[PDB]
Amino acid sequence: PPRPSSGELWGIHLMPPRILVECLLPNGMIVTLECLREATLITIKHELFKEARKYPLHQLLQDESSYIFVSVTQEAEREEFFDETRRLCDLRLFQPFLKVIEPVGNREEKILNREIGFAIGMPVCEFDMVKDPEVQDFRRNILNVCKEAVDLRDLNSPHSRAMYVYPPNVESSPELPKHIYNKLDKGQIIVVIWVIVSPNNDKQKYTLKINHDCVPEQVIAEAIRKKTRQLKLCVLEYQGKYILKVCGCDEYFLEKYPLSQYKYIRSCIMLGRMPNLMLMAKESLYSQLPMDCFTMPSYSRRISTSTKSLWVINSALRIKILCATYVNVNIRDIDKIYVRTGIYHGGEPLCDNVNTQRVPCSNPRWNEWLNYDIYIPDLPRAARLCLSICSVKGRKGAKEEHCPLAWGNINLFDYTDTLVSGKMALNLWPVPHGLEDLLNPIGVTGSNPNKETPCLELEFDWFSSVVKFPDMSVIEEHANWSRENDKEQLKAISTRDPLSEITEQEKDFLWSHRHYCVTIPEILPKLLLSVKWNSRDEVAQMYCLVKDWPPIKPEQAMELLDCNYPDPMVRGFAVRCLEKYLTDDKLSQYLIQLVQVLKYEQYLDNLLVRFLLKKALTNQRIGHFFFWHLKSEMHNKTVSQRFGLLLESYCRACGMYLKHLNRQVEAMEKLINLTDILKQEKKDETQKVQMKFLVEQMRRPDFMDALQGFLSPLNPAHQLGNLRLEECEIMSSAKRPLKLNWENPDIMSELLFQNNIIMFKNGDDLRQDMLTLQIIRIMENIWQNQGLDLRMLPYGCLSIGDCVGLIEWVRNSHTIMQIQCKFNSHTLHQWLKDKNKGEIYDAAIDLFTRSCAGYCVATFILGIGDRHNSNIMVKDDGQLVHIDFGHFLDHKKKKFGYKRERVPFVLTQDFLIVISKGAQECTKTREFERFQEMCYKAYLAIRQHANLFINLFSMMLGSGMPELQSFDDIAYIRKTLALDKTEQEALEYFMKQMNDAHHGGWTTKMDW
Amino acid sequence: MSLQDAEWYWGDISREEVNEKLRDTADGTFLVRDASTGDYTLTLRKGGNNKLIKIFHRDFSDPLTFSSVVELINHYRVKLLYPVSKYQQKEDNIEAVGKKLHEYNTQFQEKSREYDRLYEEYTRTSQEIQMKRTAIEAFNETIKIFEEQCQTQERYSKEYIEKFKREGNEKEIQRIMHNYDKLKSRISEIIDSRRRLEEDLKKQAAEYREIDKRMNSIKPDLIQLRKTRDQYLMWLTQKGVRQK
């Protein structure tokens, strides 16, 4: 299983300096050897074989070089230690013992499987043991994807190798927003190209005035001409002899994209910063690239250890609820227990929910056939049985309270299209915190891997043979047998948001015009919801329409991947649209969501998992976050098998990136252990004492080996070099997070950042903050592409485990309370004046106002936790930074019942004084009127992209957040964005909300 | 046929408030409300789903043949069986309802704070039990290895015990059995450490069942407390001055 802690032994976080080790020799002798905690296996083995001669039967012992050590790990695995350079403290031993053996089997494969198992935090061997044929088929069948991706990486070597390691960090469109192009002088970019000149490594700069649309090759050309030159200058040989890099990080310009399409350059133009690039030779980069080789695993050499159609089964649906092993209820507090069941297609029942008879707590036995108001041939391919054991107590009037105790879901047809038959044993799961509904159709399918839980016995119908779902040819068969005011209505429905009410009339209307629908392909989600899924007649017809259906924009396709669209045909169409239109930029932008909808998939093998894994294996920037989003959820037993198997195939084919990921994983495990000591054994210790322990520990060779010289999990283009130990600190707060500082080891760090600063948090769940910051980045992107420079500065946040995460530390930021502490209301403005004296004042007030407008809109829309002088920070240059978002949507509605939309960010006089440049009567100024306009524009820009936000949130319902559990929870965004209103009424609503919150000041121009 | 004072007409209430009312209700359960956009939306419970049937007026269907809403609802009253009445069915004034609201809101926060505490214990205990099961599976593997070491020592020493007895080397014979004693006593320490963990896990498994029982006991009492609190709040909202 996965290790209980990050400790050096079981129930010992850190081994003492010297430790006694039991050494079980191959001649049956046991030797107790005292070892240093940081001693390597090479050392220990030599010291053991020396001591072994002072012991009986030493004549049976071969040479020390013919043996290796094996022991039991914290993962309960017996691991063979082929890498004898490893340190005792780094072994993850359960008890301090080592067994001497002779290395057997496939050495190369055992080593790789240990590397994979380490990255995933689970032993690869556990998968081999699994009885389920779906699992063993997944493990075997996924290798097609692995092979394919590795082949595409050596298709045009070393270029295709470099394109995998260093993918171009580009926007989705070459087209420039007008506010970006206006910052260009005649459409020309002033770029600084640097050269590291041999042998002394000297830096020579060349300022170039090139066109924004210059492909990287053209940028190299002008630098040649500005150095040599035309009088002897016709060298076209440089095209394939030079490549461009960004100074201070591992971002390369390896692809023919207009320079302006590269995010670093596009950002440089917008901020008016000079792009500092680095010219280097193609060879010096191509020589760094190892040849990545995929090996077919040993399990691919092995195999996995009467039939009727569904449509020829002339009977109704019925399930036999036998009994449940037990339930955890107080017999005096509850009256009776029953099994609530339902037949679902996504989150909608296909027929009414059927309950068993009520029985005593002590007697969970029913032996009851439950009848479903559904004809067996009418059961759709994605149909599921959702059930739960519920308790009931009727003590107040005729009113009775119904509470779920345990739930479970199962696919009625399996991955091979076989309908369920015979007796079935299901271990049920605990009810998710905050869920009050008696069923959990959003929840995962299958038995709880924990067997010390309520087990419900079931039994399905046996039709004397194997019932299999009809083939596509058979389905296409059944489908062959069944004006202007309508056209304006169809377009009107297609514009509406994903969660807008659709009346039965509109459903009958959409289904009637199902063939005209093709003219407006974006109505497909609305049409799929009009289909009667419990009718094989309409479904067969829908299957034929989707088969030829025109492709839609990925932002629309992503919806058909949420829990409301479970049909494999619908999902297949969606995956094809992404394969076609989804850019690597957008895949990177919505990766949190795409990984989340993998949990909604009925089966392990599906088109979504293949598409994602393919892209992860052909783009290392995608591969990095793909791994980190899956690894962070590995502690969660509802997905650990699915995510573990997918992580195994990723790690088997990612090549050299596994070594880099394993260094990140080990750096992270050392940090979890360190903070675990501070939270437990050293919890009741002073800062001075804790810091003394922290500096003494970090100074250890094993700690310095592991926490220096690896890539940042926040951005793999960022290198974490030496730890600046004198800048590292445990924070004064109760959580005790870590501020870690690393030198940027890049040759030209000074042109980007000299130090990389990260807050390491162990204890608080950072998934919600990670999502919130991702939503802000998306909002910031929409705004820029609509021409609004509301500088948000969304810093990095990444969840890496169970309440473990990393937050990028923003430099020269101070909370409004810090500023005020070292007062009147002008204190903030004064602080800003002092830090931006002279010419640079206008820009600082400008920056503070735009970032201020961006945050007013974003926090209002999302309904994040109320803002104050401690969760709002400001940079020296004016840039506002919000931290610690907490809850969002309507978290407060359940707690206080007060039904309304809040204004988390109410601008104080302190904030108004800043925007008004020190003026009296701040709301009257042209500064405040410009700020108001910024807000109005920002609000409408997001409202215009409502479908994207509703979709992004919809793709998270099965994540774990209690304010993001149902569709009725996304309803908040529908109120704040006023989607059931007009663009004018919505703007009036946003204005009234600001007015009521600020007590006047918010005006407008009706037409102006 | 008042059409405003009607029991199934709820007017200005959202789709979500309707979904809460029609949760787990029987086929035929219904209510009418003002549309989300005058216009009226009828919501009918059919097949475990809530169907939205829009009501049109110009003087539901192509020719609107019904004079008023009550006439349309009563005609169909797949049939409009159970109307959700606006009759929940205590205090006459505002000073009494407020004093009761404050009493319930106080109870609600104490129970909620207790539930949250219980949930942290539930989660901590679940994790600890998982940690112990992995540790027992690790002791199991450790014991196997140590036992295999006895088998190996036995397999080898038998031939040397004869070879030293015929040689009368009593000192070397004692060396081998001192090692075997060291090995067997270690297996005893590992076995008893596994034993102590098995009883620690047995106790903690029981402690989990008790936390689970307590939480299933308060979950419906907390839900009902919130429902009464939200009801007293709505009453106080209604029996007070209302405007923009």
Ligand SMILES: C[C@@H]1COCCN1c1cc(C2(S(=O)(=O)C3CC3)CC2)nc(-c2cccc3[nH]ccc23)n1
């Ligand atoms: C790393 C970020 C950004 O750069 C500037 C600092 N900053 C802070 C700074 C702080 C402080 S602190 O350091 O005193 C305290 C942690 C010990 C209050 C001021 N909190 C957070 C924080 C806390 C909890 C959740 C979070 N989600 C996002 C940020 C964040 N972030």
